[PDB]
């Protein structure tokens, strides 16, 4: 619902995911964050303190920005395939648009 126009992060991130490199769902992000290889994580859930903080810890172990898209709707599933129905994503080689040096 793009009245919360922060939501256009989805639009720019799908524009990226068209050819820039990503990972999807807790284990898949946690994997490639522990590979150090991200520059941005999306967490589209109203995420509890210990689970946000572990993602945030991997964002800090890697060199990665954190974006809490925490509106329960998680419209981010438009960029990545809504089947997860919470939107935890991370972006690595964004070789398309600037997104993770614009959010920096």
Curated annotation (Swiss-Prot):
Protein keywords: Cytoplasm, Isopeptide bond, Ribonucleoprotein, Ribosomal protein, Ubl conjugation
Superkingdom field: Eukaryota
Cellular component GO terms, alphabetical: cytoplasm; cytosol; cytosolic large ribosomal subunit
Quaternary structure (record): Component of the large ribosomal subunit (LSU). Mature yeast ribosomes consist of a small (40S) and a large (60S) subunit. The 40S small subunit contains 1 molecule of ribosomal RNA (18S rRNA) and 33 different proteins (encoded by 57 genes). The large 60S subunit contains 3 rRNA molecules (25S, 5.8S and 5S rRNA) and 46 different proteins (encoded by 81 genes).
Note: Present with 59300 molecules/cell in log phase SD medium.
Family to which the UniProt record says this protein belongs: Belongs to the eukaryotic ribosomal protein eL30 family.
Pfam families on file: Ribosomal_L7Ae (PF01248)
UniProt crosslink position (Glycyl lysine isopeptide (Lys-Gly) (interchain with G-Cter in ubiquitin)): 21, 52, 82
Subcellular location: Cytoplasm
GO MF terms, alphabetically ordered: pre-mRNA 5'-splice site binding; RNA binding; structural constituent of ribosome
Gene that encodes the chain: RPL30
Name of the protein: Large ribosomal subunit protein eL30
Keyword NADP: no
Chain's role: Component of the ribosome, a large ribonucleoprotein complex responsible for the synthesis of proteins in the cell. The small ribosomal subunit (SSU) binds messenger RNAs (mRNAs) and translates the encoded message by selecting cognate aminoacyl-transfer RNA (tRNA) molecules. The large subunit (LSU) contains the ribosomal catalytic site termed the peptidyl transferase center (PTC), which catalyzes the formation of peptide bonds, thereby polymerizing the amino acids delivered by tRNAs into a polypeptide chain.
Primary location recorded for the protein, binned into one broad class: cytoplasm
Entry's Gene Ontology BP terms: cytoplasmic translation; negative regulation of mRNA splicing, via spliceosome; rRNA processing
């Amino acid at each position: 619902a793009p009245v919360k126009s922060q939501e256009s992060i989805n639009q720019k991130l799908a524009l990226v995911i068209k050819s820039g490199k990503y990972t999807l769902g807790y284990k898949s992000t946690v994997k490639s964050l522990r590979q150090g290889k991200s520059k941005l994580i999306i967490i589209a859930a109203n995420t509890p303190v210990l689970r946000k903080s572990e993602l945030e810890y991997y964002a800090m172990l890697s060199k990665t920005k954190v974006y809490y898209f925490q509106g329960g709707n998680n419209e981010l599933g438009t960029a990545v395939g809504k089947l997860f129905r919470v939107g935890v994503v991370s972006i690595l080689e964004a070789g398309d648009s600037d997104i993770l040096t614009t959010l920096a």
